[model samples]
Target: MSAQTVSGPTEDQVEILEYNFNKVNKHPDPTTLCLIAAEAGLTEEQTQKWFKQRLAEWRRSEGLPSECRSVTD
Candidate 1:
């Protein structure tokens, strides 16, 4: 949080994982669990960990900015 910007995987990495994540029940099975890690050279634990954490953020959020109706106060 100290840096000017946040840190995480390459955008491409997220794209790949997100694509698979959507196709696979909005979740990961062993094959998916294995596949993401392989693509990113991540351990299954790390990959699974990343996926869930990101999903959690989205889960708790409101709709996208473009979907907003009320003006900001």
Candidate 2:
């Protein structure tokens, strides 16, 4: 018999989402951009740009940060 396979979010997608969540949670916490950049395996400038772009998008959508989402269903 063949094994069944399940499909879900791609590994890269999951990694990016996880990184974004971490960045959003640490915002305005006085952590240098370099620190988060290292943690997320990105350059400082890249991290800064990502946060700026994501913030703008969030504001446009009036969306809550992922950290604010309930973990439990």
Candidate 3:
């Protein structure tokens, strides 16, 4: 399937969410996103948005140096 981009939170907002997520130091999984969002007082949709954005940001920042490949690639 093709990828979808969900836009809502800003990069900084995503970063903060990610920080909170990392503070837990749990396994990186789908449920982890929901848990993080709940702790951060975010709605389910907001949680999804933040998770996706932050994951993308992380991949861009730490996984790849070139912008030519998909972050998941």
Candidate 4:
């Protein structure tokens, strides 16, 4: 049951995403997310998925818990 809905993003998109991840913010708000999506030329879903993967990797490297705080808004 592993059907791929979309392929991975491009190098440019990754570059933009890492910049935001490293300098701007890790877990950004909806508005910021949209902005990053536009800057990366990616859809909101793609940007969101990239962040999710990066967040998992970040926690693993930091020896942090996998559980994340729930967003109220």
What total of clashing residue pairs does each candidate reach? 0, 0, 0, 0
- Quote model 4's TM-score: 0.69
Q: What's the TM-score of each model vs. the native?
A: 0.50, 0.46, 0.46, 0.69
lDDT of each: 0.64, 0.54, 0.59, 0.76
Best by lDDT: 4
Ranking according to TM-score, highest score first = 4, 1, 2, 3
In candidate 1, what are the lDDT values of residues 1-73, reduced to their tens digit? 4542135555666777777666666555688788667876666776676788756666457333333465655
Off by over 4 Å in 3: 1-16, 24-28, 64-73
Cα error, candidate 3, residue 18 (Å): 3.1
Candidate 4 backbone collisions, by pair: none
lDDT of 4: 0.76
Residues 1-73, model 3: lDDT tens digits: 3233245655555666767756754224577767766666565677665555555666666776444665553
Clashes of 4: 0
lDDT of 2 at 5: 17
The weakest ten consecutive residues by lDDT in model 2 span 1-10
Give all candidate RMSDs, comma-separated: 9.0, 11.6, 9.8, 7.2
Residue ranges of candidate 4 with Cα displaced over 4 Å:
1-6, 66-73
